[model samples]
Target chain A: QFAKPEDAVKYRQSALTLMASHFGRMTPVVKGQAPYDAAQIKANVEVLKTLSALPWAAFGPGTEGGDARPEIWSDAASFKQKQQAFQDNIVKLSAAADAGDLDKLRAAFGDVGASCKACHDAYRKKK
Target chain B: QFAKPEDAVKYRQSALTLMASHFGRMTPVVKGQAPYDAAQIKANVEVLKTLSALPWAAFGPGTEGGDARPEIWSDAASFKQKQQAFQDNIVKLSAAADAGDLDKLRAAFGDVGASCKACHDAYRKKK
Candidate 1:
């Protein structure tokens, strides 16, 4: 029902927030600060895989509001490249989860987090 | 990092909000409110498939804040039953999308929406 551009913006924000939520749960598990739960890790990564594909589509014209920096639209190519890298890293994280290897999952999670930070540093407004 | 109960509550809210965002896009096509785009439908359903499994896990102890009603925790068994039904319907919706049959997808989408409404009516706090 995103008939308006702002609706799309809000939609993407929700998707990204959800991505952070799931990704947040994995942080401690990956860092060994919390007890490892393979099932939860797999579930969280599976959701991340789908969510990774969503927000970029919502970054179309007129999605100028929200926490997104203008550079997202102004420097579209670079923004998209970072988005692609984020997507790729999450895919790898999902694979790592599937393999049930904590070391691989931890490494992949760090890569995914770095991808998020890179894009956020460039495109998201500081909160 | 969700050291507090409210953090988990917000986490599930984000996940459910994202679910609605993706699910909302498919409503028009499913109901003929908008033109059918197979690719969009497929992508939306894929995200729904992953999202369908998330919120329930977040409904554990201390996730009592936000728009969730007390019934969610008090009437736990029934709430879980409804959650399972919603999950099942989404799985069906995903399969319908995979089959690429508009008629099947429409029917499946309706079932999923009904499940959502049923759960909301019973458990979610009225806005």
Candidate 2:
């Protein structure tokens, strides 16, 4: 079951790992290393919306390890606040993608990354 | 870029790994190891629809290895056919999940797995 601790960890980690890929792909576009194809980025951000919803549920009680820190449980409210920021920024990112505005997309992408770092700083363990 | 060989491999592998988790979660329901929750299964299948379309493009030329057999390239037609079967079954699985019929869901799940194995048999390398 996904509720079983080990399965939960794997499930979330799998979701996050895949998240990195989908998000990371856009990195080159932002860096100007690759072309910013609006249609492609829109689809990619759409996929991210689904993946973004996945890892949080798995972070429920007893699914603590796998690069996650105790602060995730100890500081639940802040964790949730950061989660909301990331999801909100994703909506912004989606809008930018649909608008095909590279500058707005970059800013939205930074906001998402900032939200990511906010949680990682407070919740994820150092490698 | 996703077209780059190593990134392509990682992209596809990441997609497949996540696919296994989303799809595997349903195993317990089908096996009676966990209760059948139609809404949950329906949501899970919806995620699978996004992931199912990811890996195929990464299998393009120059991105050869990573548990993939030469047959994927050597026999493209068959691979496309298998891919179509898998996607088609996911639609069936989605319908069954939406219908809240466990019997139909179970059968549809089997069809999806059979499609999975059909591709794996010819393409993916053995562990």
Write down the C-alpha DockQ for each prediction. Answer: 0.65, 0.54
Query: Candidate 1, residues B36-79: lDDT per residue as tens digits?
Result: 87777887687677877878877896678888888888878888
DockQ category of candidate 1: medium
DockQ of 2: 0.54
The deviation in Å at residue A109 for candidate 1 is 2.5
Candidate 1 runs further than 4 Å off: A37-40
CA RMSD per model (angstroms): 2.2, 2.4
Model 2 TM-score (2 dp): 0.87
What is the model-wide C-alpha lDDT for candidate 1?
Answer: 0.82
Residues A1-127, candidate 2, lDDT per residue (tens digit)? 4656877787777778778778877998998988888898988899888888878888888787788888888878888888887898889988999899999999999989888888888787889
Candidate 2's C-alpha runs over 4 A off are: A31-33, B3-6, B31-33
Q: What is the TM-score of chain A alone in each candidate?
A: 0.91, 0.93
